[PDB]
Structure 1
Amino acid sequence: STGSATTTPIDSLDDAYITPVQIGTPAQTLNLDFDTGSSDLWVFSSETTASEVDGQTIYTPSKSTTAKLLSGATWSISYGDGSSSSGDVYTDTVSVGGLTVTGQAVESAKKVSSSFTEDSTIDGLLGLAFSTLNTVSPTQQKTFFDNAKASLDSPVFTADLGYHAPGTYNFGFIDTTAYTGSITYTAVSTKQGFWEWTSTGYAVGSGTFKSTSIDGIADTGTTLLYLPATVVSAYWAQVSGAKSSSSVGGYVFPCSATLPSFTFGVGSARIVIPGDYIDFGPISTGSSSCFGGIQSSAGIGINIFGDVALKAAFVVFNGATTPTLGFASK
């Protein structure tokens, strides 16, 4: 089997992407944030504290004839931005782009933090990291991909995120029309539960390529590109007036700037992120100070190839017995 679904930016900045997901019988369609940096499929629901729901579409398990309470199971998760959610668990039928999994753990939120409430466009998350990170207790649950894998034509999914435009998540096949040139595959460590790999270096604008190993994760659920402070300083040094602002929480630059591209290495291959992808717009409405799309990972503990990087590529998440990642230009 295969599946194919369109993923759409939630706003004009590509702050996140939402993908429609069918849950239950009859189908309830929710728009979920597909997140290769986590491993829980959780949703706003009829159980979510009422004051914490503001415009999201909710899953109502009592209206699904295939929903079953997973007795005794609970979940609780915290994310890198300080947000969090928790609740109980149902199993139900879940379909993405025509690919159906029966008995999928659907984690129903009883509580969500303010940032989730405040974002009316995201109805929940669909985790696509390794199932070892799943938070359900006392019995850990599998991701949608892990559950689907054995049925897929090939044990893979692909992310093809758009810049200020829709893109595609495919399951079970590689669309050879969706990229240019070849796909370069690189080793993955699953030791931390992530799609963790090592980039071979970087270049800023038209500058020379610096060969250096940068370990990081391919994370569709993170907006920006988080890299070592040395790399990030080298980038922003090429933008007149750019500086790190502790009050804003990262590098900012004059909105009048033209940003240089940023290249990252995948083996001997190179992925070029155009400068415009690195502009996240005014820091507050009407400001002439703009927020940068490349930021330091120093406070985080891990480098993160978030949407800024991934959207510049066609990315293969190869879930074969020894997983790997593939990157192509597009």
Structure 2
Amino acid sequence: STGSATTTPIDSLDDAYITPVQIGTPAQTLNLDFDTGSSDLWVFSSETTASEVXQTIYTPSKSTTAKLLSGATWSISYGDGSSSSGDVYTDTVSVGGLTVTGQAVESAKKVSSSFTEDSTIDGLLGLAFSTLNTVSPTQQKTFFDNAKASLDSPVFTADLGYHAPGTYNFGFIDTTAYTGSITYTAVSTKQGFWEWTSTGYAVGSGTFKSTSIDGIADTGTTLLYLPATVVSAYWAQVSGAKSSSSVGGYVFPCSATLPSFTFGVGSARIVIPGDYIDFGPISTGSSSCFGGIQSSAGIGINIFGDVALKAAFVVFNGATTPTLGFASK
């Protein structure tokens, strides 16, 4: 079996992407944030504190196939400080025509203010490794893990668009979606992430520097977070760029033409166009724009976020020994 679903940016800045997911019988359609940086499928629901709901909610009592997972609870917090918690049901879950039965659907009893305030996201669908799942006492498998048995191939691909819709595919590789060939690189699962090692970088038309950059492929993070000295080398090429403490990062004049940024994947090279690194104005009407490449120093890990991933076709190969594939597009 296979599945294919359209993913669309939640705003004009590509802050995040949402994908329709059908849950329960008859299907309830919710717009979820596909996150390869976490491993919980959790949704706004009829159980969520009313003052914390502004979103489409799941109602387990209206699904004939929902079953309560007795005594199971969950609690998650994310990099940004946002958090949620609740209890657990299993139910049928479909994505782009691919159906999984017995998928754990985490029902939020409470959500933090960030989730409340974002009307476009009804929940998150975790696609990292199941070791990161927060359900207790027994951790639950991700959608991808449950689907592997029936998939034509144990893969999923991410094709994110720049200010445009894209696609998540399950179980097959669309060879018309990319150019040239896919280069694969080893994944370490020791921390639960799709963690890999980039072979180096280049700024604009300059030299490629061979330097190991350990990072994670994370669809659930907006920007590209790299080591301080690598980010410094980028912004040194932009005459108006400076580090602003009040905005929290590198800002530059919106009118600048930004250089591209190249990262290595084995002996291959993925080039992020400069326009993609222009995240946008700090404020509507502002003449200053926020940079899409920022320092990872304060986060503790390098993150190849949406800024990087949307310049490529990305293959998440979930075979017993997982790898990550990248192709230009």
TM-score, length-scaled by structure 2: 0.99
Give distance in 1, aligned partners of 2:283 and 2:50.
Answer: 29
- Once the two structures are superposed, residues 118-164 of structure 1 have per-residue CA deviations (whole angstroms, 9 ceiling, x without a partner) of 11000000000000000001110000000000110100000000011
- Once the two structures are superposed, residues 196-232 of structure 1 have per-residue CA deviations (whole angstroms, 9 ceiling, x without a partner) of 0000001111111111110000000000000000000
Note the C-alpha offset of 1:241. Answer: 1.5
Give distance in 1, aligned partners of 2:195 and 2:319.
Answer: 15
Which 4+ residue blocks in structure 1 deviate beyond 3 angstroms? none
Note the C-alpha offset of 1:96. Answer: 0.3
Give distance in 2, aligned partners of 1:77 and 1:285.
Answer: 33
- Once the two structures are superposed, residues 148-185 of structure 1 have per-residue CA deviations (whole angstroms, 9 ceiling, x without a partner) of 00110100000000011000000001111110000000
SS of residue in 1 equivalent to 2:131:
helix
Moved more, 249-258 or 278-287: 278-287
SS of residue in 1 equivalent to 2:108:
strand
Give distance in 1, aligned partners of 2:318 and 2:244.
Answer: 40
- Once the two structures are superposed, residues 246-291 of structure 1 have per-residue CA deviations (whole angstroms, 9 ceiling, x without a partner) of 1111111111211111000000000000011111111123221211
- Once the two structures are superposed, residues 49-82 of structure 1 have per-residue CA deviations (whole angstroms, 9 ceiling, x without a partner) of 11111xx100000100000111111111111111
Give distance in 2, aligned partners of 1:35 and 1:75.
Answer: 17
Partner of 1:123: 122
Q: Which runs of 5+ in 2 are unaligned?
A: none
SS of residue in 1 equivalent to 2:76:
strand
Give distance in 2, aligned partners of 1:283 and 1:48.
Answer: 33
TM-score, length-scaled by structure 1: 0.99
Name the Cα RMSD after superposition.
Answer: 0.6
Give distance in 2, aligned partners of 1:329 and 1:133.
Answer: 30
- Once the two structures are superposed, residues 15-43 of structure 1 have per-residue CA deviations (whole angstroms, 9 ceiling, x without a partner) of 00000000000000000000000000000
Give distance in 2, aligned partners of 1:184 and 1:3.
Answer: 23
Matched length: 328
Give distance in 2, aligned partners of 1:44 and 1:257.
Answer: 41
SS of residue in 1 equivalent to 2:51:
helix
Partner of 2:77: 78
Give distance in 1, aligned partners of 2:82 and 2:306.
Answer: 18
Give distance in 2, aligned partners of 1:138 and 1:86.
Answer: 14
Give distance in 2, aligned partners of 1:175 and 1:286.
Answer: 40
Give distance in 2, aligned partners of 1:52 and 1:255.
Answer: 36
Report 1:171-210 matches (<5 A): 171-210=170-209
SS of residue in 2 equivalent to 1:178:
coil
- Once the two structures are superposed, residues 61-119 of structure 1 have per-residue CA deviations (whole angstroms, 9 ceiling, x without a partner) of 01000001111111111111111111111000000000000000000111111111111
Give distance in 1, aligned partners of 2:81 and 2:23.
Answer: 27
Give distance in 2, aligned partners of 1:133 and 1:203.
Answer: 33
Give distance in 1, aligned partners of 2:4 and 2:65.
Answer: 23
SS of residue in 2 equivalent to 1:7:
strand
Give distance in 2, aligned partners of 1:244 and 1:117.
Answer: 31
SS of residue in 1 equivalent to 2:185:
strand
User: What is the percentage of aligned positions where both structures have the same residue?
Assistant: 100
SS of residue in 1 equivalent to 2:196:
strand
